[PDB]
Coordinates of C-alpha atoms in Angstrom, one line a residue:
Chain A
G3 CA 157.8 71.8 103.1
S4 CA 155.5 68.9 104.0
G5 CA 156.6 65.9 106.1
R6 CA 156.2 62.1 105.6
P7 CA 154.1 59.5 107.5
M8 CA 155.4 57.8 110.6
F9 CA 157.4 54.5 109.7
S10 CA 157.8 53.2 113.3
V11 CA 160.0 50.2 112.7
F12 CA 162.4 52.0 110.5
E13 CA 162.7 55.1 113.1
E14 CA 163.5 52.5 115.7
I15 CA 166.2 51.0 113.7
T16 CA 167.7 54.5 112.7
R17 CA 167.5 55.6 116.4
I18 CA 169.4 52.6 117.5
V19 CA 172.2 53.4 114.9
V20 CA 172.5 57.0 116.2
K21 CA 172.5 55.8 119.7
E22 CA 175.4 53.3 119.3
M23 CA 177.6 55.7 117.0
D24 CA 176.8 59.4 118.2
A25 CA 174.6 59.0 121.5
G26 CA 173.9 62.6 122.8
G27 CA 175.8 64.1 119.8
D28 CA 174.7 65.9 116.6
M29 CA 173.9 62.9 114.5
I30 CA 170.4 62.7 113.3
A31 CA 168.2 59.5 112.7
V32 CA 166.3 59.3 109.3
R33 CA 162.6 59.0 110.4
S34 CA 161.1 57.6 107.1
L35 CA 162.7 55.3 104.6
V36 CA 161.0 57.4 101.9
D37 CA 163.6 60.1 102.5
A38 CA 166.7 57.9 102.9
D39 CA 167.5 58.8 99.2
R40 CA 167.1 62.6 99.4
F41 CA 169.3 62.9 102.6
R42 CA 172.7 62.2 101.0
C43 CA 175.8 64.5 101.2
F44 CA 175.5 67.7 99.3
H45 CA 171.5 67.4 99.5
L46 CA 169.6 70.3 101.0
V47 CA 167.1 69.6 103.9
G48 CA 164.4 72.1 105.2
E49 CA 163.7 72.6 108.8
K50 CA 160.1 73.7 109.6
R51 CA 158.4 74.2 113.1
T52 CA 155.9 71.7 114.3
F53 CA 154.3 71.1 117.6
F54 CA 157.1 68.7 118.8
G55 CA 159.7 71.2 117.8
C56 CA 161.5 70.9 114.5
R57 CA 161.0 68.7 111.5
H58 CA 163.4 68.0 108.8
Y59 CA 162.1 67.5 105.4
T60 CA 163.4 66.7 101.9
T61 CA 163.8 69.3 99.2
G62 CA 165.2 67.2 96.3
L63 CA 167.7 70.1 95.8
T64 CA 171.4 69.9 96.3
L65 CA 174.1 72.4 96.7
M66 CA 175.0 72.6 93.0
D67 CA 171.3 73.5 92.2
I68 CA 171.7 76.8 94.0
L69 CA 175.6 77.4 93.9
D70 CA 177.4 79.2 91.0
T71 CA 180.5 77.4 89.9
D81 CA 197.0 71.9 97.5
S82 CA 193.4 70.9 98.0
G83 CA 192.7 69.3 94.8
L84 CA 189.5 71.5 94.1
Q85 CA 190.7 73.4 90.9
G86 CA 189.0 71.9 87.7
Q87 CA 187.0 68.6 88.3
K88 CA 184.2 69.8 85.9
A89 CA 182.3 71.6 88.9
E90 CA 179.2 69.7 87.9
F91 CA 180.3 66.3 89.6
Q92 CA 181.8 68.1 92.6
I93 CA 179.4 65.9 94.6
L94 CA 181.1 62.6 93.8
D95 CA 184.6 64.0 94.0
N96 CA 184.2 65.9 97.4
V97 CA 182.4 63.1 99.1
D98 CA 184.9 60.8 100.8
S99 CA 184.4 57.3 102.2
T100 CA 185.3 57.7 105.8
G101 CA 185.1 54.1 107.1
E102 CA 182.9 51.3 107.9
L103 CA 180.9 50.5 111.3
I104 CA 179.0 47.8 112.9
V105 CA 175.8 48.4 114.9
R106 CA 174.8 45.7 117.5
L107 CA 171.0 45.5 117.5
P108 CA 168.8 45.1 120.6
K109 CA 166.7 42.0 121.3
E110 CA 163.6 43.2 119.6
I111 CA 165.2 43.8 116.2
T112 CA 166.0 40.8 114.1
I113 CA 167.8 40.6 110.8
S114 CA 167.3 38.4 107.9
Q123 CA 172.5 40.7 115.7
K124 CA 174.6 43.3 113.8
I125 CA 174.2 45.5 110.9
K126 CA 177.0 46.9 108.8
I127 CA 177.2 50.6 107.6
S128 CA 179.3 52.8 105.7
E129 CA 180.1 56.4 106.4
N130 CA 180.6 59.4 103.7
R131 CA 181.7 62.8 104.5
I132 CA 182.0 66.0 102.6
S133 CA 185.8 67.1 102.6
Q134 CA 186.7 69.8 105.1
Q135 CA 188.5 71.5 102.1
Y136 CA 185.3 71.9 100.2
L137 CA 183.3 73.0 103.2
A138 CA 185.9 75.6 103.7
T139 CA 185.3 77.0 100.3
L140 CA 181.7 77.9 101.1
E141 CA 182.3 81.3 102.4
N142 CA 181.0 84.5 100.7
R143 CA 179.8 82.1 97.8
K144 CA 177.2 83.5 95.2
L145 CA 174.1 81.8 94.3
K146 CA 173.1 81.0 90.6
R147 CA 171.3 83.5 88.5
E148 CA 168.5 80.8 88.0
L149 CA 167.5 79.5 91.2
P150 CA 164.8 76.6 91.2
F151 CA 161.3 77.2 92.5
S152 CA 161.9 74.7 95.5
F153 CA 164.6 77.3 96.6
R154 CA 163.2 80.7 96.2
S155 CA 159.8 79.8 97.4
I156 CA 161.2 78.5 100.9
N157 CA 159.3 80.2 103.8
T158 CA 161.9 82.7 104.9
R159 CA 161.3 81.8 108.5
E160 CA 162.4 78.2 108.1
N161 CA 165.9 77.0 108.0
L162 CA 168.0 75.2 105.4
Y163 CA 170.7 72.8 106.1
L164 CA 173.3 70.9 103.9
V165 CA 173.9 67.1 104.7
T166 CA 177.7 66.7 105.5
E167 CA 177.9 63.2 106.7
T168 CA 175.8 60.0 106.2
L169 CA 175.7 56.4 107.3
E170 CA 174.1 53.9 104.9
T171 CA 173.6 50.4 104.5
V172 CA 176.0 48.4 102.5
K173 CA 173.6 45.8 101.1
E174 CA 169.9 45.1 101.1
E175 CA 168.8 44.2 104.6
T176 CA 165.5 43.1 106.1
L177 CA 164.5 43.7 109.8
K178 CA 161.9 43.0 112.2
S179 CA 160.9 44.4 115.5
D180 CA 158.8 42.4 117.9
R181 CA 158.6 45.5 120.2
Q182 CA 155.1 46.1 121.4
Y183 CA 153.6 49.6 122.1
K184 CA 151.7 50.0 125.4
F185 CA 148.9 51.7 123.9
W186 CA 148.1 48.8 121.5
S187 CA 146.6 46.8 124.4
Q188 CA 145.2 49.6 126.6
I189 CA 143.1 51.4 124.2
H198 CA 146.2 42.1 116.7
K199 CA 149.7 42.6 115.1
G200 CA 153.0 40.7 116.2
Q201 CA 156.0 41.9 114.1
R202 CA 156.9 44.9 112.1
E203 CA 159.2 44.4 109.1
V204 CA 160.9 46.8 106.8
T205 CA 163.3 46.0 103.8
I206 CA 166.1 48.6 103.3
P207 CA 167.7 48.8 100.0
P208 CA 171.6 49.0 99.7
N209 CA 173.3 52.2 100.1
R210 CA 170.2 53.9 101.9
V211 CA 171.0 56.6 104.4
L212 CA 170.1 55.8 108.1
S213 CA 171.7 58.8 109.9
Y214 CA 173.1 62.1 108.9
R215 CA 174.8 65.2 110.1
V216 CA 173.9 68.7 108.8
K217 CA 175.6 72.1 108.7
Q218 CA 173.4 75.2 108.3
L219 CA 173.3 77.4 105.3
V220 CA 173.1 81.1 105.8
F221 CA 172.0 83.8 103.4
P222 CA 172.9 87.3 104.4
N223 CA 171.1 88.5 101.3
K224 CA 169.3 87.2 98.2
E225 CA 172.6 86.8 96.3
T226 CA 174.9 85.4 98.9
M227 CA 175.6 82.1 100.8
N228 CA 177.8 81.2 103.8
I229 CA 178.0 77.9 105.7
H230 CA 177.5 78.0 109.5
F231 CA 179.4 75.4 111.5
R232 CA 178.5 75.8 115.2
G233 CA 175.6 77.5 116.9
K234 CA 171.9 78.0 116.5
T235 CA 171.0 80.8 113.9
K236 CA 168.7 81.7 111.1
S237 CA 169.4 81.0 107.4
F238 CA 167.7 84.1 106.3
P239 CA 168.7 86.7 108.7
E240 CA 168.5 90.0 106.5
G241 CA 166.4 92.5 108.5
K242 CA 165.9 90.4 111.5
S243 CA 167.3 90.7 115.2
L244 CA 168.6 88.4 117.8
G245 CA 165.4 87.2 119.4
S246 CA 164.6 84.7 122.1
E247 CA 163.0 81.8 120.6
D248 CA 160.0 79.8 121.9
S249 CA 160.4 77.7 125.0
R250 CA 156.9 76.5 125.8
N251 CA 156.4 72.8 126.8
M252 CA 153.8 70.7 125.3
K253 CA 150.9 71.3 127.8
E254 CA 151.4 75.0 127.6
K255 CA 151.2 74.7 123.8
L256 CA 148.3 72.5 123.7
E257 CA 146.4 74.8 126.2
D258 CA 147.1 77.8 124.1
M259 CA 145.7 76.0 121.2
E260 CA 142.5 75.2 122.8
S261 CA 142.0 78.8 123.9
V262 CA 142.8 79.9 120.4
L263 CA 139.7 77.8 119.2
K264 CA 137.5 79.1 122.0
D265 CA 137.9 82.6 120.5
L266 CA 136.0 81.4 117.6
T267 CA 132.3 81.9 116.4
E268 CA 130.4 78.4 116.6
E269 CA 130.1 78.8 112.9
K270 CA 133.8 79.2 112.4
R271 CA 134.3 76.4 115.0
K272 CA 132.0 74.1 112.9
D273 CA 134.0 75.0 109.7
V274 CA 137.3 74.2 111.3
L275 CA 136.0 71.1 112.9
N276 CA 134.5 69.7 109.6
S277 CA 137.5 70.6 107.5
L278 CA 139.5 68.8 110.0
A279 CA 137.4 65.7 110.2
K280 CA 137.6 65.3 106.5
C281 CA 141.4 64.9 106.8
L282 CA 141.3 61.7 108.9
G283 CA 142.6 58.9 106.9
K284 CA 142.9 61.2 103.8
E285 CA 146.6 62.1 103.2
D286 CA 145.9 64.3 100.2
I287 CA 143.3 66.5 101.9
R288 CA 145.7 66.8 104.8
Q289 CA 148.5 68.0 102.7
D290 CA 146.5 70.4 100.5
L291 CA 144.9 72.0 103.7
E292 CA 148.4 72.2 105.2
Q293 CA 149.7 73.8 102.1
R294 CA 146.7 76.2 101.8
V295 CA 146.8 77.3 105.3
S296 CA 150.5 77.9 105.0
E297 CA 149.9 80.0 101.9
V298 CA 147.4 82.3 103.6
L299 CA 149.8 82.5 106.7
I300 CA 152.6 83.8 104.6
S301 CA 150.4 85.9 102.3
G302 CA 147.9 87.2 104.8
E303 CA 145.3 87.4 102.0
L304 CA 142.4 85.0 101.1
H305 CA 141.4 84.9 97.4
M306 CA 138.0 83.9 95.9
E307 CA 139.3 80.5 94.4
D308 CA 139.3 78.2 97.6
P309 CA 136.8 75.5 98.0
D310 CA 138.0 75.3 101.8
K311 CA 137.4 79.0 102.0
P312 CA 135.4 78.6 105.3
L313 CA 138.4 77.2 107.1
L314 CA 140.7 79.8 105.6
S315 CA 138.0 82.4 106.7
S316 CA 138.2 81.1 110.2
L317 CA 141.9 82.2 110.4
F318 CA 140.7 85.7 110.3
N319 CA 139.3 87.9 113.0
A320 CA 136.1 89.9 112.9
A321 CA 138.1 92.8 111.6
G322 CA 139.3 90.6 108.5
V323 CA 142.8 90.4 109.8
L324 CA 144.5 87.1 109.9
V325 CA 145.2 85.6 113.4
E326 CA 148.5 83.7 113.1
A327 CA 147.8 81.7 116.1
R328 CA 144.9 80.0 114.4
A329 CA 146.8 79.2 111.3
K330 CA 149.8 77.9 113.4
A331 CA 147.5 75.6 115.5
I332 CA 145.7 74.2 112.4
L333 CA 149.1 73.5 111.0
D334 CA 150.4 71.8 114.0
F335 CA 147.3 69.6 114.0
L336 CA 147.8 68.7 110.4
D337 CA 151.4 67.9 111.0
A338 CA 150.7 65.8 114.2
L339 CA 148.3 63.8 112.0
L340 CA 151.4 62.4 110.1
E341 CA 152.6 60.7 113.4
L342 CA 149.2 58.8 113.4
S343 CA 149.5 56.2 110.6
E344 CA 147.5 53.5 112.4
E345 CA 145.2 55.5 114.7
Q346 CA 143.3 57.9 112.4
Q347 CA 140.4 55.3 112.2
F348 CA 140.0 55.2 116.0
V349 CA 139.9 59.0 116.2
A350 CA 137.4 59.3 113.4
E351 CA 135.3 56.6 115.0
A352 CA 135.3 58.3 118.5
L353 CA 134.4 61.7 116.7
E354 CA 131.5 60.1 115.0
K355 CA 130.1 58.2 118.0
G356 CA 131.0 61.0 120.3
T357 CA 133.5 59.1 122.5
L358 CA 136.5 61.3 122.2
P359 CA 136.5 62.0 126.0
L360 CA 137.0 58.2 126.8
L361 CA 139.9 58.1 124.3
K362 CA 141.5 61.2 125.7
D363 CA 141.4 59.7 129.1
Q364 CA 142.8 56.4 128.0
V365 CA 145.8 58.1 126.1
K366 CA 146.5 60.3 129.2
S367 CA 146.4 57.0 131.4
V368 CA 149.1 55.5 129.0
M369 CA 151.3 58.6 129.2
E370 CA 151.0 58.8 133.0
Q371 CA 151.8 55.0 133.4
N372 CA 154.8 54.6 131.1
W373 CA 156.4 58.0 130.8
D374 CA 157.2 60.9 133.2
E375 CA 155.9 64.4 132.6
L376 CA 155.9 63.5 128.9
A377 CA 153.0 66.0 128.3
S378 CA 155.5 68.7 129.8
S379 CA 158.5 67.7 127.6
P380 CA 161.0 70.4 126.7
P381 CA 160.6 71.8 123.1
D382 CA 162.7 69.8 120.5
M383 CA 163.1 66.6 122.7
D384 CA 164.3 63.5 121.1
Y385 CA 161.1 61.5 120.9
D386 CA 161.0 57.6 121.0
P387 CA 158.3 56.6 118.2
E388 CA 155.9 55.3 120.7
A389 CA 156.0 58.6 123.0
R390 CA 155.7 60.8 119.8
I391 CA 152.7 58.7 118.6
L392 CA 151.1 59.2 122.0
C393 CA 151.7 62.8 122.2
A394 CA 150.3 63.3 118.6
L395 CA 147.2 61.2 119.5
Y396 CA 146.7 63.3 122.6
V397 CA 146.9 66.6 120.7
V398 CA 144.8 65.5 117.8
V399 CA 142.0 64.2 120.2
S400 CA 142.1 67.2 122.5
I401 CA 141.7 69.6 119.5
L402 CA 138.8 67.6 118.0
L403 CA 137.0 67.3 121.3
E404 CA 137.3 71.0 122.1
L405 CA 136.0 71.9 118.6
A406 CA 132.9 69.6 119.3
Chain B
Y6 CA 203.6 24.1 96.5
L7 CA 200.6 22.9 94.2
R8 CA 200.5 19.6 96.2
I9 CA 200.0 21.4 99.4
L10 CA 196.9 23.2 98.1
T11 CA 195.6 19.9 96.4
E12 CA 195.9 18.1 99.7
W13 CA 194.3 21.0 101.7
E14 CA 191.4 20.8 99.3
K15 CA 190.6 17.1 100.3
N16 CA 188.7 18.1 103.3
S17 CA 185.6 19.4 101.4
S18 CA 183.4 20.3 104.3
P19 CA 179.6 21.2 103.8
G20 CA 179.3 24.7 102.7
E21 CA 183.1 25.1 102.2
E22 CA 183.6 26.4 98.7
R23 CA 187.1 25.0 98.7
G24 CA 187.2 24.5 94.9
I25 CA 186.8 28.3 94.5
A26 CA 189.6 28.7 97.0
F27 CA 192.0 26.4 95.3
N28 CA 191.3 28.3 92.1
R29 CA 192.1 31.7 93.5
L30 CA 195.2 30.4 95.5
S31 CA 196.6 28.9 92.3
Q32 CA 196.0 31.9 90.4
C33 CA 197.4 34.2 92.9
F34 CA 200.6 32.3 93.1
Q35 CA 201.2 31.6 89.4
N36 CA 200.4 35.2 88.4
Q37 CA 202.1 36.8 91.4
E38 CA 198.8 38.7 92.2
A39 CA 199.0 41.4 94.8
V40 CA 195.5 40.6 96.4
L41 CA 194.0 37.3 97.4
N42 CA 190.4 37.4 98.3
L43 CA 188.8 34.3 99.7
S44 CA 185.5 36.0 101.2
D45 CA 182.2 34.4 101.6
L46 CA 183.5 30.9 101.1
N47 CA 182.7 29.6 104.7
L48 CA 186.3 28.3 104.9
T49 CA 187.4 26.9 108.1
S50 CA 191.1 26.7 107.4
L51 CA 193.8 28.2 105.3
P52 CA 197.0 26.5 103.7
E53 CA 200.4 28.2 103.4
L54 CA 199.8 31.5 101.8
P55 CA 201.5 33.0 98.8
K56 CA 204.4 35.0 100.3
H57 CA 204.1 37.9 97.7
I58 CA 200.6 39.1 98.7
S59 CA 200.0 42.8 99.6
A60 CA 196.5 42.4 100.7
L61 CA 194.6 39.3 102.3
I62 CA 190.9 39.5 102.3
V63 CA 189.2 36.5 104.1
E64 CA 186.0 38.3 105.3
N65 CA 182.8 36.3 106.1
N66 CA 184.1 32.8 106.5
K67 CA 184.5 30.3 109.5
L68 CA 188.3 30.7 110.3
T69 CA 189.6 29.9 113.9
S70 CA 193.2 30.7 113.2
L71 CA 195.3 32.2 110.7
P72 CA 198.6 30.9 108.9
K73 CA 201.7 32.8 109.0
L74 CA 201.1 36.2 107.3
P75 CA 203.3 37.1 104.2
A76 CA 206.3 39.2 105.1
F77 CA 205.1 42.3 103.1
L78 CA 201.3 42.2 103.8
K79 CA 200.0 45.7 103.7
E80 CA 196.4 45.0 104.4
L81 CA 194.6 42.2 106.3
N82 CA 190.8 41.9 106.3
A83 CA 189.5 39.0 108.3
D84 CA 186.3 40.6 109.5
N85 CA 183.3 38.2 110.6
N86 CA 185.4 35.2 111.4
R87 CA 186.0 33.0 114.5
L88 CA 189.6 34.1 115.1
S89 CA 190.4 33.8 118.7
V90 CA 194.1 35.1 118.0
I91 CA 195.9 36.5 115.1
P92 CA 199.4 35.6 114.1
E93 CA 202.6 37.8 114.2
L94 CA 202.1 41.0 112.2
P95 CA 204.6 42.0 109.5
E96 CA 206.1 45.5 110.1
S97 CA 204.8 46.3 106.4
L98 CA 201.1 46.1 107.7
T99 CA 199.3 49.4 107.5
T100 CA 195.7 48.2 107.8
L101 CA 194.3 45.6 110.0
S102 CA 190.7 44.7 110.0
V103 CA 189.6 41.8 112.2
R104 CA 186.4 43.1 113.5
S105 CA 183.3 40.9 114.3
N106 CA 185.7 37.9 115.5
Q107 CA 186.4 36.3 118.9
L108 CA 189.5 38.2 120.0
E109 CA 190.6 38.9 123.6
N110 CA 194.2 40.1 122.9
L111 CA 196.1 41.6 120.1
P112 CA 199.7 41.1 119.1
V113 CA 202.3 43.7 119.0
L114 CA 201.3 46.4 116.5
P115 CA 203.6 47.5 113.7
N116 CA 204.6 51.1 114.4
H117 CA 203.5 52.2 110.8
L118 CA 200.1 50.9 111.1
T119 CA 197.5 53.5 110.1
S120 CA 194.0 51.7 110.4
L121 CA 193.0 49.3 113.2
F122 CA 189.5 48.0 113.2
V123 CA 188.8 45.4 116.0
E124 CA 185.3 46.4 117.0
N125 CA 182.8 43.5 117.9
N126 CA 185.3 41.4 120.1
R127 CA 186.1 40.5 123.7
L128 CA 189.5 42.5 123.9
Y129 CA 190.5 43.1 127.6
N130 CA 193.8 45.0 126.6
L131 CA 195.2 46.9 123.9
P132 CA 199.0 46.9 123.0
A133 CA 201.1 50.1 122.5
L134 CA 199.4 51.9 119.9
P135 CA 201.5 52.6 116.8
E136 CA 202.7 56.1 116.3
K137 CA 201.4 56.4 112.7
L138 CA 197.9 55.1 113.8
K139 CA 195.2 57.4 112.3
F140 CA 191.9 55.5 112.6
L141 CA 191.0 53.2 115.6
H142 CA 187.7 51.3 116.3
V143 CA 187.8 49.3 119.5
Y144 CA 184.0 49.8 120.3
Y145 CA 182.1 46.9 121.5
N146 CA 184.9 45.4 123.6
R147 CA 185.7 44.9 127.2
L148 CA 188.7 47.3 127.5
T149 CA 189.2 48.8 130.9
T150 CA 191.9 51.4 130.0
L151 CA 193.3 52.6 126.7
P152 CA 197.0 53.0 125.9
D153 CA 198.1 56.5 125.6
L154 CA 197.0 57.8 122.3
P155 CA 199.4 58.5 119.4
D156 CA 199.8 62.0 118.0
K157 CA 198.4 61.4 114.5
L158 CA 195.1 59.7 115.7
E159 CA 192.1 61.1 113.9
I160 CA 189.2 58.8 114.6
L161 CA 189.0 56.8 118.0
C162 CA 185.7 54.8 118.5
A163 CA 186.0 53.4 122.0
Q164 CA 182.1 53.4 123.0
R165 CA 180.7 50.5 124.4
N166 CA 183.5 49.2 126.6
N167 CA 184.2 48.9 130.3
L168 CA 186.6 51.9 130.5
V169 CA 187.2 53.3 133.9
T170 CA 189.7 56.2 133.2
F171 CA 190.0 58.8 130.6
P172 CA 192.8 58.0 128.2
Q173 CA 196.0 60.1 127.9
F174 CA 196.0 62.4 125.1
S175 CA 199.0 63.7 122.9
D176 CA 199.0 67.3 124.5
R177 CA 197.2 68.7 121.5
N178 CA 200.5 68.0 119.4
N179 CA 198.0 67.3 116.6
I180 CA 196.0 70.3 115.1
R181 CA 193.8 68.5 112.6
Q182 CA 190.2 67.5 113.0
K183 CA 189.7 64.5 115.4
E184 CA 186.6 62.8 116.8
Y185 CA 187.2 60.6 120.1
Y186 CA 184.0 58.5 121.1
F187 CA 183.7 57.2 124.7
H188 CA 180.1 56.9 125.4
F189 CA 178.6 54.0 127.3
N190 CA 181.5 53.3 129.4
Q191 CA 182.4 53.6 133.3
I192 CA 184.4 56.7 133.5
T193 CA 183.6 58.9 136.5
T194 CA 186.3 61.6 136.1
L195 CA 188.1 63.7 133.6
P196 CA 191.6 65.1 133.7
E197 CA 192.3 68.9 134.0
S198 CA 194.1 68.7 130.7
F199 CA 190.6 68.5 129.2
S200 CA 190.1 72.2 129.9
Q201 CA 193.2 73.0 127.6
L202 CA 192.1 71.2 124.6
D203 CA 191.2 73.0 121.3
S204 CA 188.1 73.1 119.3
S205 CA 189.7 70.6 116.8
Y206 CA 188.4 67.7 119.2
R207 CA 184.9 66.2 119.1
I208 CA 184.6 64.1 122.3
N209 CA 181.6 62.0 123.2
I210 CA 181.4 60.7 126.8
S211 CA 177.6 60.4 126.9
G212 CA 176.3 57.5 128.9
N213 CA 179.0 57.7 131.5
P214 CA 178.9 57.6 135.5
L215 CA 180.4 61.1 135.5
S216 CA 180.6 62.6 139.0
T217 CA 178.6 65.6 140.2
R218 CA 181.7 67.6 140.4
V219 CA 182.9 66.7 136.9
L220 CA 179.5 67.4 135.6
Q221 CA 179.2 70.8 137.2
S222 CA 182.7 71.8 136.2
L223 CA 181.9 70.7 132.6
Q224 CA 178.6 72.9 132.8
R225 CA 180.6 75.9 134.2
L226 CA 183.3 75.5 131.6
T227 CA 181.1 75.1 128.4
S228 CA 178.5 77.9 129.6
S229 CA 181.3 80.4 129.8
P230 CA 181.2 82.9 126.8
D231 CA 184.8 82.3 126.7
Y232 CA 184.7 78.6 125.9
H233 CA 187.0 77.5 122.9
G234 CA 187.6 74.1 123.8
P235 CA 186.4 70.6 122.5
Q236 CA 182.9 69.9 121.0
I237 CA 181.9 67.9 124.0
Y238 CA 178.8 65.7 124.5
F239 CA 177.8 64.6 128.0
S240 CA 174.5 63.1 128.6
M241 CA 173.0 60.3 130.7

């Protein structure tokens, strides 16, 4: 359920692809090259809730890993349904802006799952042996099926000379990425719903929950980023200075350390889903701070820490600065600088509506702001 | 015929792989091969073409004009060339791909043409669209209007043009799934007929100077619990 570090130049390219082909539509840009192989048609994608809204993450699963098996659908082995029911639906040209160089246009190829096949995904029964990646999904997250992809047709190398304003207002010229052939750049999804533990339907239009059994129609979160960050700060002020020290140290050990961050995220998610703390956690202090004086888990603390840990992923080149400012006690100056850049180049970006499409620079500034604010309040 | 190709070979420009081209042309004529592919040869000209060919693929070259097309061509792929004009199209043509070239106009389009890809050009006008047309790419051009759309048209990519008026549709005479892209244009109004289109339409008119009245009517129409119209996207 974890995400992937920030790959800024690649996200720039894929977002340009999405703007020129489905501006304002439902096509989604692949953020990380690392995921451009597990976002193909028939692949299953998870949707988790973060500070900025929703994050799509790879599962490695496909529809065939969970589904029991004049349209041309009878026969076909039922094991290679992936290649047979994915049709090439044309080729397209994306004109690149001035900041992007190619080793002025990139060619891409579109693949789609046939509407016929997608029409058979009603009242389908899941397999009797479901992979652990599927049955251990947090029953509050969503699950999607990749329906359409746009991919490169050959190996490309691209450069961005675009400069981020916060680089000079807080020594690298161009950012380069080499994309292998047939790598997905943008995709479209359709939601998978599971009315019970043995059934699966496809959902085409409208927001919904993939696991609706026992749940009711409920108005979802609509807070902006400022409200969310302030509620986080209040959550940490309801903490014993000892619990505050525990959390601050556990978080400080994560800067520049991807494995510590991933393990802490997974463990906080574990204790959020279970509500229990066992006697086999070295990071038991942090996991202890998630419980109130009555030994009951405060989900707000777990969600705040998970949002901090997820925001750390958008800071691929900035965690060293934050750690230095935490050690030298200069986080106030850093927070002021970040707020200044946000107020100079963007408008009310700190009050952005939930699940806003963020340009990479904007998302990096917001993640930096959240991380610095949390570390400052905890100290 | 062999002497014509041999004399055409005598140019031998820098980067022109004209020997490979002579081999492929002679093989195509002598064996009566349905497909002739001269792609990625940096060629600047083409001789008389084997008049039996079904598909001519001359993508990624330096062509500025094209010879007379064989009378039974089904597919013509001339992407990424410098073609400022393309010759008369045979009625047997069903796929025309000449994207990424230097075209400002197109000839009369055979009525049984199924695929037309002319994106990345400088087109100012489009001819009457063939009735059997199913897939059309005209994005990255300078079109100000579009001909009335045929009935069997499934994919229309007309974004990034200079469109001023919304095109005339086929009165929902088609009932399959269709995606029409009009984003990044100059359309300021929409016809009332829009409110009678089915859910089978996916229309993208984002990045358009839509008037306040059109935007408010779109918001009132899509916000109604009783909206079963097109999947519409409108965002500036």
